[PDB]
Design a binder for this molecule. Structure first.
Ligand SMILES: O=c1[nH]cnc2c1ncn2[C@@H]1O[C@H](CO)[C@@H](O)[C@H]1O
Ligand code: HPA
Ligand SMILES: [Zn+2]
Ligand SMILES: [Zn+2]
Length: 355
């Protein structure tokens, strides 16, 4: 892959067709911060697992897709999160998990990603077939390292723990303890699923930072919530370095100023927000006004295996419907690298290699 430099960003895209634009999108040196490894599979990988383990013998491929994935516009975040629970059928042994991780790296390299942060949920992957969380973790860390070494370190991978099991104090403590225990591999900690104001778990998140682990949580995504409290908590109480989505920052001048004052970056997932019905359309997506207001934002794919969309698709949508330029896209990837949780050298070397 012959990546675009900072000295090649004046390209005239107006005469290119969709196909030729995707070559440019691919060639952009991307840093992706918000993507769930759990569902980071191609359609063929997914159908290969469903067939190999004989999970849906009476369903056709089209039916398998309607039943497990989320490729069409839905109602809400809540609907997405509850539907996602059924494809946990695939997390059947530790080989499926290791392969998932390895292929995810390969797919991201081919899309032109150079610094990839993946996040996974131990509880998501473990509960269906009662798999051991540490054995999952082992499988995940082997797969990712397998792929990186095979690619001669042409893509670098960071790993984040999306902690869950539930919102009981015991479950959330356990989830944070799993991450802390594996902090040699986890560069950050997340909360996902149904959106929550995490104020009752400040004690746990303090602990995680005490242990040297950066926080990026999902907050300010779900537009059905009649307040912005999850955002205030993430910023003031959790001391997040980044926010997953955080698009509802756009609804408050006070929060716009707060995130800029703290140099917090918003992990924006354009297509996710459309499909999960958190913006009216891509035309009206808040990323535009947030970028224009000086908020640091990056571009991400979120759940590519469920959406049947990839990182470059999100770039296409931002170009076509919101008129982001190549220079804008390069700026955001520079921000994504700078605000990455991986080793500071890896960042600096990537920065001077491309940006
Ligand atoms: O499709 C998915 N991929 C990855 N993670 C998911 C998905 N659906 C839900 N979670 C959610 O992430 C939680 C962390 O607080 C997971 O346990 C689960 O609730
Ligand atoms: O709960 C979630 N899990 C995984 N990806 C997501 N993207 C938005 N919400 C979620
Ligand atoms: Zn264990
Ligand atoms: Zn997400």
């Amino acid at each position: 892959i012959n990546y675009l430099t900072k000295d090649e960003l004046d390209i005239d895209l107006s005469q290119m067709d969709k196909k030729e634009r995707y070559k440019i999108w691919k060639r952009l040196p991307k840093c992706e911060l918000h993507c769930h490894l759990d569902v980071c599979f191609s359609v063929d990988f997914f159908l290969n697992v469903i067939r190999k383990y004989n999970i849906q013998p009476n369903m056709s491929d089209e039916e398998i897709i309607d039943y497990y994935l989320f490729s069409k516009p839905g109602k809400s975040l809540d609907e997405f999160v509850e539907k996602a629970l059924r494809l946990t059928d695939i997390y059947i042994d530790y080989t499926v998990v290791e392969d998932l991780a390895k292929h995810a790296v390969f797919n991201k390299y081919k899309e032109g990603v150079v610094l990839m942060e993946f996040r996974y949920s131990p509880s998501f992957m473990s509960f269906k077939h009662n798999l051991d969380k540490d054995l999952i973790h082992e499988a995940i860390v082997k797969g990712l390292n397998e792929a990186v070494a095979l690619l001669e370190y042409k893509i670098q991978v960071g790993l984040l723990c999306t902690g869950d099991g539930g919102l009981s104090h015991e479950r959330m403590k356990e989830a944070a303890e799993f991450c802390i225990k594996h902090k040699k591999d986890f560069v950050g900690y997340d909360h996902a699923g149904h959106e929550v104001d995490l104020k009752p778990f400040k004690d746990i998140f303090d602990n995680i930072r005490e242990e040297g682990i950066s926080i990026s949580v999902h907050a300010g995504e779900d537009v059905s919530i009649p307040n912005l409290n999850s955002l205030y908590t993430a910023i003031n109480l959790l001391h997040v370095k980044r926010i997953g989505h955080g698009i509802r920052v756009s609804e408050s001048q006070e929060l716009i100023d707060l995130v800029k004052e703290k140099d917090i970056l918003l992990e924006v997932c354009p297509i996710s927000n459309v499909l999960l019905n958190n913006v009216k359309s891509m035309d009206t997506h808040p990323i535009r006004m947030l970028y224009d207001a000086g908020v640091k934002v990056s571009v991400n794919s979120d759940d590519p295996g469920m959406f049947l969309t990839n990182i470059t698709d999100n770039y296409e949508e931002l170009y076509t419907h919101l008129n982001f330029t190549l220079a804008d896209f390069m700026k955001m990837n520079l921000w994504a690298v700078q605000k990455s949780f991986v080793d500071p050298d890896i960042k600096n070397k990537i920065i001077s290699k491309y940006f």
